[PDB]
Amino acid sequence: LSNSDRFSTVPVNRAKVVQHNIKHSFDLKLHLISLLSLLVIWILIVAI
């Protein structure tokens, strides 16, 4: 029982735990990064 307090009598919805860990986590903005990179390339090649 040296680890009795780390187990919960109630069932655990681990799927919701993972969903919350993903909801409240850092968001790598690849869409914004890609759009900005495309704009930079177009401006540096075509506009200038």
Partner: protein
Amino acid sequence: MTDEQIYAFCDANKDDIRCKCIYPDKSIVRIGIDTRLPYYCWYEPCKRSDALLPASLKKNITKCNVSDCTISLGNVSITDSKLDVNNVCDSKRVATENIAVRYLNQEIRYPIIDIKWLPIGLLALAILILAF
């Protein structure tokens, strides 16, 4: 409550289900003896949560069907791996490949440049006067 109070209370009420394996019938004790299984390890009132037990009964129940199995590892050195020493010697089955997920209460760092940059940045703007 103390052991003496337990004995006095259970002698006052010897038919209470709460105290029925501290003072069980001789029949139960000798059935347990004749089966090579002590009665306090299987007799239901002992297993009851609200049942009151003395010190001796508790320290004898704590040795109920206890095994003797040991693991003696030496110098263990693992890298990028997982070590799971189970040493399990009972009916309980260890939950293999059971991913234990906790709540990652992650604290998001923000892209705040050290505001000591504020003077230097101003200097940057200042150098436009060189282009005038």
